[PDB]
mmCIF file of N, CA and C and ligand atoms in Angstrom:
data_model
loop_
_atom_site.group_PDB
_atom_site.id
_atom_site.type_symbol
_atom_site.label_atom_id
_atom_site.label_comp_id
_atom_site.label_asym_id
_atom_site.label_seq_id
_atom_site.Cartn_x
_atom_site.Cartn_y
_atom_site.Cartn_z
ATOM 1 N N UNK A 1 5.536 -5.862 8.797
ATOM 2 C CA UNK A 1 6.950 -5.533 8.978
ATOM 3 C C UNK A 1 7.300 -5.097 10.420
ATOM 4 N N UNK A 2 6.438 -5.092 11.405
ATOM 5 C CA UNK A 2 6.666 -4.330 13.068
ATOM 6 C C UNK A 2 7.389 -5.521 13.356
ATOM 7 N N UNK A 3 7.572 -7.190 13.092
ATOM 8 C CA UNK A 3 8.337 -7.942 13.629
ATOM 9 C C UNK A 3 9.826 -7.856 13.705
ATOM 10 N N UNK A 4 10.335 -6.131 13.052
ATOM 11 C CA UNK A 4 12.042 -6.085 12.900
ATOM 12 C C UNK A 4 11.606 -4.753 13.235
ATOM 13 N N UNK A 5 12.999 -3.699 13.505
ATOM 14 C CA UNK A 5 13.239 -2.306 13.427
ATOM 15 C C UNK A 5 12.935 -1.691 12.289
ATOM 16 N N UNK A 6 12.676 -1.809 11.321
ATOM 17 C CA UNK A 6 12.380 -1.156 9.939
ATOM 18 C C UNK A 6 11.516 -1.979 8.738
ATOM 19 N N UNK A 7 10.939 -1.323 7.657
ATOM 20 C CA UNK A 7 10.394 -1.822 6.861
ATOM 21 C C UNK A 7 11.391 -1.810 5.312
ATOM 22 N N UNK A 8 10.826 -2.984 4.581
ATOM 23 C CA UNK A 8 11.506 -3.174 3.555
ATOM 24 C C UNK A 8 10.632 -2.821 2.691
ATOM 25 N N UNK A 9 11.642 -2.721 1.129
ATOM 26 C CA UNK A 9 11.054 -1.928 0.128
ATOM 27 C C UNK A 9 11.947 -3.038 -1.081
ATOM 28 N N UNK A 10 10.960 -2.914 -2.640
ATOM 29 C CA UNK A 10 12.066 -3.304 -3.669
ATOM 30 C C UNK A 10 11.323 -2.345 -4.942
ATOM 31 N N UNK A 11 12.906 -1.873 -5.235
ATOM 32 C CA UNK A 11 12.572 -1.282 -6.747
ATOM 33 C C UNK A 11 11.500 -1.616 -7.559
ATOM 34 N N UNK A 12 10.782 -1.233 -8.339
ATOM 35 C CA UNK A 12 9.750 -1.608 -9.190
ATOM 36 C C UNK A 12 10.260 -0.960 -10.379
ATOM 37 N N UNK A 13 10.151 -2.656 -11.869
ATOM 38 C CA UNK A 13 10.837 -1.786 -13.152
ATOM 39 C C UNK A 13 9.913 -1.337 -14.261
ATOM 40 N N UNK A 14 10.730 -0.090 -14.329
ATOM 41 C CA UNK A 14 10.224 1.095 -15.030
ATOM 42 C C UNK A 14 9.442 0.885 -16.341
ATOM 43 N N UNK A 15 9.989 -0.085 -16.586
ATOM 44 C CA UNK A 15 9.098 -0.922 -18.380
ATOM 45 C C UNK A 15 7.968 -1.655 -17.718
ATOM 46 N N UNK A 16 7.948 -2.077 -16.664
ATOM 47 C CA UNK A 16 7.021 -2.632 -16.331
ATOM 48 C C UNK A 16 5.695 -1.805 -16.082
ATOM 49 N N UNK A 17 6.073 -0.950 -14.849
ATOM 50 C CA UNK A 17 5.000 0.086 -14.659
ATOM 51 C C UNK A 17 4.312 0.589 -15.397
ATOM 52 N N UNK A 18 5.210 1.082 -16.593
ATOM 53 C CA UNK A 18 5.062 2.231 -17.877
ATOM 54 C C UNK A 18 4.273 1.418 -18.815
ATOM 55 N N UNK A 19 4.500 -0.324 -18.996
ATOM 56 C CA UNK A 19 3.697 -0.608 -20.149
ATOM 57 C C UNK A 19 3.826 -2.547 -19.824
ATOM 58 N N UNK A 20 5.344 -2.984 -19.923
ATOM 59 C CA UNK A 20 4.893 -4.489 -19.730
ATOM 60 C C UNK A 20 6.829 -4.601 -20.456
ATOM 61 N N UNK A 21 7.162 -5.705 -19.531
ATOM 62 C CA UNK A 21 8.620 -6.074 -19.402
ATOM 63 C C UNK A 21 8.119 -7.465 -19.195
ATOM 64 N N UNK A 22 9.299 -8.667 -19.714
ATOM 65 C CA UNK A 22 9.405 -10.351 -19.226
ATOM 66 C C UNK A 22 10.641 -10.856 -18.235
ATOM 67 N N UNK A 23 11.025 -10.047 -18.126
ATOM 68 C CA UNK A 23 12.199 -10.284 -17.258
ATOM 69 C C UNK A 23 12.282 -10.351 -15.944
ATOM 70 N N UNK A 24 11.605 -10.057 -15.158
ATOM 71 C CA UNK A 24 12.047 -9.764 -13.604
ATOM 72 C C UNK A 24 11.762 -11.118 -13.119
ATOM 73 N N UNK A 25 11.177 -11.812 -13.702
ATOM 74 C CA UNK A 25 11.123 -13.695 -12.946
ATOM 75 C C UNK A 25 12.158 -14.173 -12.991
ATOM 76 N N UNK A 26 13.326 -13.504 -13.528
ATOM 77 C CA UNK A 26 14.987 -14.079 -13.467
ATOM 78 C C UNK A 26 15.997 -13.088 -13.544
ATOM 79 N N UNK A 27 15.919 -12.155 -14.447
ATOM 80 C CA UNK A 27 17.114 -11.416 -15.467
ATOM 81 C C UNK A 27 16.332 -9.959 -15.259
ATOM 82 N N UNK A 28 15.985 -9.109 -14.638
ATOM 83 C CA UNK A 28 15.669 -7.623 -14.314
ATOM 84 C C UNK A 28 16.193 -7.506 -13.657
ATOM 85 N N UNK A 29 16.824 -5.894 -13.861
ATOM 86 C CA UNK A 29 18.141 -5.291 -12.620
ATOM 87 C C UNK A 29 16.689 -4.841 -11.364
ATOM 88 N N UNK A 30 15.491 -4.887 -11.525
ATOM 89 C CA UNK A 30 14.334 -4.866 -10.907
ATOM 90 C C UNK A 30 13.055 -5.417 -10.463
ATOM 91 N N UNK A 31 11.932 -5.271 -9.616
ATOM 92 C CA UNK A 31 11.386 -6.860 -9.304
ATOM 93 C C UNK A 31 9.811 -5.958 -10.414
ATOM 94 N N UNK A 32 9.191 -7.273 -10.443
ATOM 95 C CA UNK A 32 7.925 -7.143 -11.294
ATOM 96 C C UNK A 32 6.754 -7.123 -10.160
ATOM 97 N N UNK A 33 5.865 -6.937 -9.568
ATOM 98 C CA UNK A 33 4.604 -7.020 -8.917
ATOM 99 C C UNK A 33 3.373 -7.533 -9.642
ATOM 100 N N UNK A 34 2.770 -8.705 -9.132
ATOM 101 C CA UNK A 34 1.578 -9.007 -9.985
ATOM 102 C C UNK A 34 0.285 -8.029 -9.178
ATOM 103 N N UNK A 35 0.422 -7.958 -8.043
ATOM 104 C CA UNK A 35 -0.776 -6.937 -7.241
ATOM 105 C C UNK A 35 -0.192 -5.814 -7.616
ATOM 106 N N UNK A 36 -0.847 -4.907 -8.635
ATOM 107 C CA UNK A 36 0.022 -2.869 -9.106
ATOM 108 C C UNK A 36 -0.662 -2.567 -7.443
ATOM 109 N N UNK A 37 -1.584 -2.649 -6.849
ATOM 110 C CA UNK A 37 -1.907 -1.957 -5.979
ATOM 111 C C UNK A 37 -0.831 -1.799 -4.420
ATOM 112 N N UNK A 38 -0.029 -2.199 -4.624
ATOM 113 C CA UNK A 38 1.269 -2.921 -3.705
ATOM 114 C C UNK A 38 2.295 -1.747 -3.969
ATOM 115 N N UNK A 39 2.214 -0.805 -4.924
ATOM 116 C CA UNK A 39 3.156 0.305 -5.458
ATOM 117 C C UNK A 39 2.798 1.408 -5.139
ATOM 118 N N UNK A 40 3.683 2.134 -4.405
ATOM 119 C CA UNK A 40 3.585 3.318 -3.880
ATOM 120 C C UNK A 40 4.031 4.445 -4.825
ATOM 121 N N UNK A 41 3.466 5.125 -5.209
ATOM 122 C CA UNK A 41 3.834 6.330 -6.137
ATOM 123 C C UNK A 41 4.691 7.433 -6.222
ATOM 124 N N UNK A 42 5.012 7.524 -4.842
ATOM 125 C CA UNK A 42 5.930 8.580 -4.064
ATOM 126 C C UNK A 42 7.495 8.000 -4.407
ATOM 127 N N UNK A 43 7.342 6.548 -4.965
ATOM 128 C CA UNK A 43 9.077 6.163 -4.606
ATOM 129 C C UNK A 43 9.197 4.737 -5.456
ATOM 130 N N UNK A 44 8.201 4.690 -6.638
ATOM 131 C CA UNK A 44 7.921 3.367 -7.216
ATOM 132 C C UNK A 44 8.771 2.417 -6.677
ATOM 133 N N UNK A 45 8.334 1.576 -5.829
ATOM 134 C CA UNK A 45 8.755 0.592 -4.499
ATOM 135 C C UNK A 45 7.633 0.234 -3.970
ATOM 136 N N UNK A 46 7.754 -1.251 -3.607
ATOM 137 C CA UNK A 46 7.189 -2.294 -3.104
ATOM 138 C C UNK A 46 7.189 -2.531 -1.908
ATOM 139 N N UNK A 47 5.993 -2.753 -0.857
ATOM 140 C CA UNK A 47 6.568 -3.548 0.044
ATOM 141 C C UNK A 47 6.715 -5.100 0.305
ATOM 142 N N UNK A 48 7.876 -5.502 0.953
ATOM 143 C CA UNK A 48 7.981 -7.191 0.602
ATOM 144 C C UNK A 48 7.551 -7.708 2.158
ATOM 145 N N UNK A 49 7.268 -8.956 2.077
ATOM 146 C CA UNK A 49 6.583 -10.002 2.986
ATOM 147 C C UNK A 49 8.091 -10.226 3.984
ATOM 148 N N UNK A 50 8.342 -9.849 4.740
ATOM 149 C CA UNK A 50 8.536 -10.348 6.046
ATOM 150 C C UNK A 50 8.930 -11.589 6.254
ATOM 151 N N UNK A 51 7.984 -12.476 6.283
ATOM 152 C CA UNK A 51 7.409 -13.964 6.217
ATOM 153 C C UNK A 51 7.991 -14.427 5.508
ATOM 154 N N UNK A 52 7.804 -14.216 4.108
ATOM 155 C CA UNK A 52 8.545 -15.188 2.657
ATOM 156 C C UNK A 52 9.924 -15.019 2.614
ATOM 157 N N UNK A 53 10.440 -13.708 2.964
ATOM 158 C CA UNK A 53 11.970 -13.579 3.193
ATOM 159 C C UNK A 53 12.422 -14.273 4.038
ATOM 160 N N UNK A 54 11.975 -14.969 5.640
ATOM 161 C CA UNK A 54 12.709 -15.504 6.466
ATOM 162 C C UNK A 54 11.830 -16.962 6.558
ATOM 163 N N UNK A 55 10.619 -17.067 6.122
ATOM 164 C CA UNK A 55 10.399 -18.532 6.632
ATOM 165 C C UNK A 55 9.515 -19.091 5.469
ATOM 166 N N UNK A 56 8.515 -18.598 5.141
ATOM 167 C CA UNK A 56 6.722 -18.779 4.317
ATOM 168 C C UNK A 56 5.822 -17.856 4.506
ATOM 169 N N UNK A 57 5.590 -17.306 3.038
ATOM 170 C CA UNK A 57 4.326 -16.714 3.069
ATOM 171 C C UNK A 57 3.808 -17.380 1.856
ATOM 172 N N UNK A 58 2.530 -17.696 1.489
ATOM 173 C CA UNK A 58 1.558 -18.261 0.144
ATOM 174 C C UNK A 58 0.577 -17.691 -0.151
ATOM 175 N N UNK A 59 -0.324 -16.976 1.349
ATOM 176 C CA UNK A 59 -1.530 -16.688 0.773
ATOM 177 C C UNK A 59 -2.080 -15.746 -0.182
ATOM 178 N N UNK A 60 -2.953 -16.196 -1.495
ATOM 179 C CA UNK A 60 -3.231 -15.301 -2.317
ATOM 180 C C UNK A 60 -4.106 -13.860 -2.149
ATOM 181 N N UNK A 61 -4.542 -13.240 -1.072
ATOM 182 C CA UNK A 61 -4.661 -12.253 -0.769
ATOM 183 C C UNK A 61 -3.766 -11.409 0.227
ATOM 184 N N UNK A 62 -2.785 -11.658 0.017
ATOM 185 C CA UNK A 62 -1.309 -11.491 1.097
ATOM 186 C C UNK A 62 -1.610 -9.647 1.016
ATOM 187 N N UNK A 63 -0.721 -8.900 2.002
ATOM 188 C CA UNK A 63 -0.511 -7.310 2.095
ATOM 189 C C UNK A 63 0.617 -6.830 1.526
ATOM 190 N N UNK A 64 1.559 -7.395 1.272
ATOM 191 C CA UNK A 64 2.989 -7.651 0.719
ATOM 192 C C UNK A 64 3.465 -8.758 -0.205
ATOM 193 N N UNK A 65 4.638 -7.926 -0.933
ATOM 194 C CA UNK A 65 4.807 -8.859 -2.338
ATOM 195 C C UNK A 65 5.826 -9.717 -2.006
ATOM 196 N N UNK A 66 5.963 -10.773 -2.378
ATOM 197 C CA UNK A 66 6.797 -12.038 -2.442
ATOM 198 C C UNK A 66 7.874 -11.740 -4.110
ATOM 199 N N UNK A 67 9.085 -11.957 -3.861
ATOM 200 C CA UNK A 67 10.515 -11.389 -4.927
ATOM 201 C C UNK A 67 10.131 -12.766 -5.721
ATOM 202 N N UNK A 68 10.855 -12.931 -6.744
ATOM 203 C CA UNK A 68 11.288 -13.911 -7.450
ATOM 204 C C UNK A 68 13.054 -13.820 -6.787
ATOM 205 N N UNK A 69 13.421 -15.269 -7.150
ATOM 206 C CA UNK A 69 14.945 -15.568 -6.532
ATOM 207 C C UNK A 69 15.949 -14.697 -7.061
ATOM 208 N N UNK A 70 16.112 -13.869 -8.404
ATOM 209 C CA UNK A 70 16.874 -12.766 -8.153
ATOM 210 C C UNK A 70 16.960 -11.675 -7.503
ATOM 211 N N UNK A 71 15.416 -11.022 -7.138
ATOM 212 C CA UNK A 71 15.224 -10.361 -6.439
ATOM 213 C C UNK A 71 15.810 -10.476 -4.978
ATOM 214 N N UNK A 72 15.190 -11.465 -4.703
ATOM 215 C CA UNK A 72 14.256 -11.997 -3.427
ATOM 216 C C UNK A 72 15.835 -12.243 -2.458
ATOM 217 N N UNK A 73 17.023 -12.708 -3.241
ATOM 218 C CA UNK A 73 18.494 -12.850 -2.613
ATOM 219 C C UNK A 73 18.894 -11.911 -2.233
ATOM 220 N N UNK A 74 18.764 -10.365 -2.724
ATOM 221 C CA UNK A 74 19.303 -8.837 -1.968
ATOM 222 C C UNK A 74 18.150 -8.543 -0.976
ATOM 223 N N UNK A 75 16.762 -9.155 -0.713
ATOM 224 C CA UNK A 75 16.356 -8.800 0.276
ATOM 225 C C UNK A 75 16.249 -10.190 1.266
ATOM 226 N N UNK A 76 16.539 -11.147 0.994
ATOM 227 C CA UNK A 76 17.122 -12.104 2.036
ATOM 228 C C UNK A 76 17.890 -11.751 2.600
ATOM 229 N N UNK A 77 19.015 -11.130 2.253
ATOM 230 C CA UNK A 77 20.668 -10.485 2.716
ATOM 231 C C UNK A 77 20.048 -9.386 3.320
ATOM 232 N N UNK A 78 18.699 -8.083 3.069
ATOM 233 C CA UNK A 78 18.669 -7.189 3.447
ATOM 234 C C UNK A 78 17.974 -7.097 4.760
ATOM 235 N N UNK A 79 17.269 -8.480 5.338
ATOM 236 C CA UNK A 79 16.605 -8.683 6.659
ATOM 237 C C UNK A 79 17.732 -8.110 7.765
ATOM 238 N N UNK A 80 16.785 -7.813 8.878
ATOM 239 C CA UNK A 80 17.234 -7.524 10.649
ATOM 240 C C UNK A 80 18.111 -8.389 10.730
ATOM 241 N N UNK A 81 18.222 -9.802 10.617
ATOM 242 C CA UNK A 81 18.943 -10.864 11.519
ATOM 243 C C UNK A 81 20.082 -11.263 10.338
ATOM 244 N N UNK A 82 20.322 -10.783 9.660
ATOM 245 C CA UNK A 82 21.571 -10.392 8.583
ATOM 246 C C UNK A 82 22.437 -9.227 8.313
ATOM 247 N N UNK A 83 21.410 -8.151 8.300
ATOM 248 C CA UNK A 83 22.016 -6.809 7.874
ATOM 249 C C UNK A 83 21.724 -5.955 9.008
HETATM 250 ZN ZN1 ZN B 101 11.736 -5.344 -16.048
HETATM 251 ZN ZN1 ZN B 102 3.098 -12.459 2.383
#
């Protein structure tokens, strides 16, 4: 995230954390994480890829989580070179 002024974050949902939700691949007011280790405890929040928001990210040992397209549209809008 040092490639902008600030780092990004996305909600993490609460059914999910707590036990197991199907929704956040479309229809969650929140995003799902397949890496739990990506969740910070202090503020259940994610950090997101940089990369996948403005151009490509794929790799399966990535440092940051990649949104699904409901998500992934409030932090497209929420990048440096938009917001
Ligand atoms: Zn959910
Ligand atoms: Zn990535």
């Amino acid at each position: 995230a040092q490639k902008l002024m600030r780092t990004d974050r996305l909600e993490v949902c609460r059914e999910y954390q707590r036990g197991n939700c199907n929704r956040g691949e479309n229809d969650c007011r929140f995003a799902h994480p397949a890496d739990s280790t990506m969740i910070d405890t202090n503020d259940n929040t994610v950090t997101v890829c940089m990369d996948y928001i403005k151009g490509r990210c794929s790799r399966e040992k990535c440092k940051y989580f990649h949104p699904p397209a409901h998500l992934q549209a409030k932090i497209k809008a929420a990048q440096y070179q938009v917001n």
